[PDB]
């Protein structure tokens, strides 16, 4: 069943943060991508058995992070890129 925005607002009101994530991560779509530490995109080619990661051309081989987001998000970001917009995903707090 659709857990729509109109319901989400009711979970926010209540203050239940964890449930509201669980219900939008474990149930429905969750996903694991690899982000580059220099450029904040999904360029990284995940060779997940030879440990070799590499953000090619971009010349990175070390700075790479595993993150947990919904697939519908990843999808949204790829679509935004294909439309020629870079949505940078960074990991550390300050600028």
């Amino acid at each position: 069943l659709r857990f729509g925005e109109m319901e989400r607002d009711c979970m926010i009101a209540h203050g239940a943060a964890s449930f509201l994530k669980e219900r939008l991560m474990e149930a429905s779509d969750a996903f694991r991508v690899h982000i580059c530490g220099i450029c904040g995109l999904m360029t990284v080619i995940a060779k997940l058995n030879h440990n070799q990661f590499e953000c090619k051309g971009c010349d990175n081989k070390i700075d790479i992070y595993q993150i947990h987001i919904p697939y519908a998000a990843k999808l949204l970001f790829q679509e935004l890129m294909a439309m020629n917009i870079t949505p940078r995903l960074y990991t550390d707090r300050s600028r």
């Binding site: 607002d9 926010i12 203050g15």
Partner: protein, 336 residues
């Protein structure tokens, strides 16, 4: 006039009436139509418009402004509607179905905006109310930093009544045989009659009690006393005079110092904002202001003793209690 003539006639054993009397379903209007008459029918403010030229139905002449022609149903649902009456009522009810099908569309859009606009407003760990940027919206949530669930409509009875009727209630005058606390009420009754160290404090309170009465009448210009405030006191009082079982024919054991300097020290620690600088403490004072006008009006020297004869323990509990019940009514940082 017809309806409230049927309402008068309906026996106490009349089922319809008994559901109204309970409030389970039904109201006056429902009875009026069912037995008396259904009344005038309307579409967009005005009674039934001329749809045909200069008439409402082709069963009528032109230029007819009488009741039945323009949409009055003289009949009850129990008697039955007439052909025209029927059609007329049809027009009227159909209007209800229409706007409802458009209210719910308009509303559902209102709400989605409302929700989308205020969204990220939450009270942070300091009672400051702000958004995602940190733009203050309120400095204390709901101008007083109190969660709305814990709040009840209590009468602020410093506002009401004659100046005569107010002195009669709150004024204690130790250097006045007539306007003193009869040794009936207090243990130290007559052994206080006179005195000047304890009329400085008794005066002290009575002065604030009058400073309050004007300050309130200034805010709630209406004369309306009953106002949503934290911690129900009328109850904590009852819950003392039955919890400690105290007769209304034998005296107390409280000093005048015990009363007056208690209330003032309770006031001292009804915390809402907890910072230790200049500004913060003035907000703190301001956020309680209204609550305290109540506190003071009910924990008044004469009141405590003449109205609801407390005892040293029971009074010290009533304070211990209030402080605790108040501390709970604060909004929790997090609340969205």
């Amino acid at each position: 006039k017809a309806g409230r003539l049927a309402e008068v006639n309906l026996k106490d054993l009349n089922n319809v009436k008994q559901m109204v009397m309970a409030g389970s379903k039904g109201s006056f209007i429902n009875i009026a139509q069912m037995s008396a008459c259904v009344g005038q029918q309307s579409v967009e403010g005005k009674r039934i418009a001329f749809g045909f030229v200069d008439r409402t139905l082709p069963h009528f002449s032109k230029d007819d402004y009488s009741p039945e022609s323009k949409g009055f149903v003289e009949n009850s649902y129990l008697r039955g509607l007439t052909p025209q009456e029927f059609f007329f009522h049809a027009m009227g009810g159909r209007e209800g179905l229409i706007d409802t099908a458009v209210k719910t569309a308009e509303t559902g859009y209102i709400q989605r905006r409302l929700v989308k606009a205020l969204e990220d407003i939450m009270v942070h760990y300091d009672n400051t109310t702000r958004n995602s940027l940190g733009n203050v919206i309120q400095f204390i949530y709901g101008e007083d930093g109190m969660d709305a669930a814990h709040i009840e409509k209590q009468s602020l009875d410093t506002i009401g009544g004659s100046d005569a009727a107010f002195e009669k209630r709150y004024r204690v005058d130790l250097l006045n045989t007539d306007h003193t606390l009869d040794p009936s009420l207090l243990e130290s009754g007559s052994e206080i009659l006179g005195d000047l160290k304890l009329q400085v404090l008794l005066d002290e309170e009575y002065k604030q009690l009058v400073k309050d009465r004007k300050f309130l009448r200034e805010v709630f210009v209406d004369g309306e006393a009953n106002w949503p405030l934290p911690v129900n006191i009328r109850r904590i009082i009852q819950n003392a005079q039955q919890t400690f079982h105290i007769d209304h024919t034998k005296p107390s054991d409280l000093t005048i110092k015990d009363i007056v300097l208690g209330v003032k020290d309770l006031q001292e620690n009804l915390l809402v904002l907890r910072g230790k600088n200049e500004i913060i403490q003035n907000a703190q004072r301001d956020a309680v202001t209204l609550f305290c006008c109540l506190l003071r009006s009910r924990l008044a020297t004469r009141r405590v003793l003449q109205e609801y004869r407390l005892t040293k323990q029971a009074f010290d509990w009533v304070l211990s209690n209030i402080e605790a019940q108040f501390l709970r009514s604060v909004v929790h940082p997090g609340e969205m």
